[PDB]
Amino acid sequence: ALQLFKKLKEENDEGLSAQIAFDLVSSASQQLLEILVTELTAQGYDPALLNILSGLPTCDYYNTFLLNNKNIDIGLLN
Amino acid sequence: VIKFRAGVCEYNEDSRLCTPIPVQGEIEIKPNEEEELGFWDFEWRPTEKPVGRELDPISLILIPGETMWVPIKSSKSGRIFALVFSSNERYFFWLQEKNSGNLPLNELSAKDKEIYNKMIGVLNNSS
Amino acid sequence: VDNMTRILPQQSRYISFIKDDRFVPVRKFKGNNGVVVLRDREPKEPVALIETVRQMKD
Amino acid sequence: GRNVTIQLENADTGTLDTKSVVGLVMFSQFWYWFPLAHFLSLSFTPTTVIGIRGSDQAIPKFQMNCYAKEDAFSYPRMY
């Protein structure tokens, strides 16, 4: 997983790195993400990668969708 | 007492550099009552992120109308709380009022209407 | 169909982004629901934007 | 708000999603201790294409062509 990121370091294209990562976090083990963040820290990799892999960015995007488009049945409460 | 997030920003008049030096902390205006001039103290103190220009806790007197509130005194960056003592107590300050994050915005904060009023209130009124 | 709405998977299969439109994804669309990263052709053009919730709360 | 569905697995890479699996098993056994009902929340995943600007992190409003019968896939009534 690590090696894959090293190639994209060289490109310096933020868009591509992000798109790969977002798919990886969904699938990947709770364990897998945790050791990978350490490794990337020690390379000197941009902190922007580390943040997505902590998974809080995706939590926020998915939270936004829910708030705006929520259609509440009022009948449930009654 | 009237608290808000603000940081220090270097004052300048040679070239008008006036770039913020980041910090976080808070600015605290105390209404006082000292004399009819008000002397509402603009205290600047780091409550947080002391990194950047330390600006050790110090309270500054206010002489009303001599201060010139001008939003983009630098004319290079937003959120320039400018207090112009005719270079005697002239310090510049940079808002970080979390509302769209720290980011400098022209014509002060993201809550445009509010901070314009706040600014008239402190400078003009004297206790 | 506006971005950031509920979309059933069946509808999603048949979606193709306008290529003239600024937003076209960096690499090809998943073909199905989930977070898809767009290339912004011009940031300079003003777009009505919905800040991520984190920022709204700060 | 009628916008969530339970994903069996990340069929994208064809390996079992961790969250849905655990969720379902803890929910399913509830006869003994009634509060075990709440574990089903954890399997929910919203279905929504969310565009991301890959360098500012903000959602642009824009519209895509969708070959669809809009009426068919439009939201059901308010229950």
Provide the 8-state DSSP code for A76.
Answer: T
Nearest chain A CA: its distance from D15 CA (Å): 7
* Straight-line distance from the first to the last Cα atom of chain A, in angstroms, rounded to the nearest whole number: 51
Contacts of B4 (CB under 8 A, 6+ apart): B26, B27, B95, B97, B118
Residue of A nearest to C36 (CA): A19
Three-state DSSP class for residue B14: coil
- Residue from D13, D43, D47 to probe the interface with A (highest A Cβ count within 10 Å): D13
Please enumerate in sequence order all residues whose Cβ is within 8 A of that of C40, keeping only pairs 6 or more positions apart, or say none: C22, C23, D53, D54, D55, D56, D60
CA distances from D57 to A31, A52, A62, C35 (A): 26, 11, 13, 12
Q: Are strands B92-95 and C15-16 parallel, antiparallel or unpaired?
A: unpaired
Cα(A21)–Cα(B107) distance, integer angstroms: 38
**Closest CB to D46 among A62, A73, A75:** A62
Cβ C52–D75 below 8 Å, yes or no? no
* Cα gap B20→B8, rounded to integer Å: 7
Its sign, for the CA torsion C40, C42, C44, C50, is negative
How determined? cryo-EM
C36–D51 CB contact, under 8 Å? yes
* Cβ–Cβ below 8 Å for C52 and A58: no
